[PDB]
């Protein structure tokens, strides 16, 4: 739970643009 550096505030941005 650190892929960018710890969630980019979000998750990866909002869960990576809502599941893509």
Request: net charge neutral.
């Given at each position: ?8 505030f979000?998750?990866?941005?909002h869960l ?5």
């Open positions: 739970s650190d892929t960018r550096y710890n969630k980019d979000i998750n990866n941005k990576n643009e809502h599941a893509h």
